[PDB]
Design a protein around this ligand. Sequence first.
Ligand code: HEM
Length: 366
Amino acid sequence: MYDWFSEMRKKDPVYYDGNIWQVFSYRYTKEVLNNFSKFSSDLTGYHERLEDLRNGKIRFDIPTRYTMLTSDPPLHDELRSMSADIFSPQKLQTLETFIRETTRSLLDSIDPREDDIVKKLAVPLPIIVISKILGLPIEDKEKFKEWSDLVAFRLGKPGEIFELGKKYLELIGYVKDHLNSGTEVVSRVVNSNLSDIEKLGYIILLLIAGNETTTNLISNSVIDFTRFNLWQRIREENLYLKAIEEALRYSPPVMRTVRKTKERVKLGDQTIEEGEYVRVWIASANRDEEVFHDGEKFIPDRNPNPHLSFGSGIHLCLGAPLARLEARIAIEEFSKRFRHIEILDTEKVPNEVLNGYKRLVVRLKS
Ligand code: HEM
């Protein structure tokens, strides 16, 4: 649907189709994302229940409705400041050896003749890394794999209520079980003025917000580098940093995000009424010809590359530096292991927001 995106960017960058508003151009998607006053992220009733949560009036509820992702400032900033430096440059420098050793370990498990790199590399890496950072027992990776499906970007589908109930029951129980054995990261959260439900929500967000997305970055990168035959060049010219950024732009793990109008507002030539949902197409903005010359092409050394794959504004992905580091080390170590790669079989996740692969079977020549 990238051709439909281009047509919309040209004729209706801000389009109303009866029920929701949709934005396709780079200029307007960025404007929406940055104007948090007009375009709110308070879509889960968080602000409305903050008083009763902090009072202990609400005792039970789905914890994932109360995270920094579904909040506007000042609440949003009060929450985010508790972990603003979790992925600081110094912290990541120190994690480099652990991340590199971990992917080398995962690569060691790959059978060159024919293996699934999503299963052996892309899925485990982010999970193992976040577990170390949070101080949660890696010995529960498989469970973590299951719970990663709960990431907020994923919308509902019929017949999942029982399955989801099971995961929530286990996940919540696990977090409550390890709230006081985590790193300073979780300690600061557990020792704040937040209600119990919010603490749960906060820890779950940090635990699952980047698993499927980071996995998708690695998978999408492997697919793009292979299909456009760039492995040789990337190693040769050391285009890892720029190439991964071009994968993020071209094959964004998250296709779009949503906002709700906080009052009548004019975006472009349109006046969006108060209380309307606005779908922001990150994938389309990333192809905007005005901002990305030859945007329909995968240019490995494209520079600069101001894509919106991690968002923009106050909710700009907290894990961006980590995701970038993990993916880079993954792709570097992988490239150093094979002389030729061949994609034998793939299976794509069936979702309109999360963009990635469920299976990626390849054959490698070490
Ligand atoms: C390549 C992988 C990733 C992609 C493409 C991705 C994408 C995003 C996007 C689009 C947003 C903004 C959502 C919005 O504006 O409504 C976001 C927010 C967030 N992401 Fe990521 N993410 C990735 C990896 C990670 C990782 C590794 C973590 C670490 C736990 C993480 C933690 C978060 C958090 C906590 C937020 C909310 C921040 C806030 O609301 O201020 N993400 N992510």
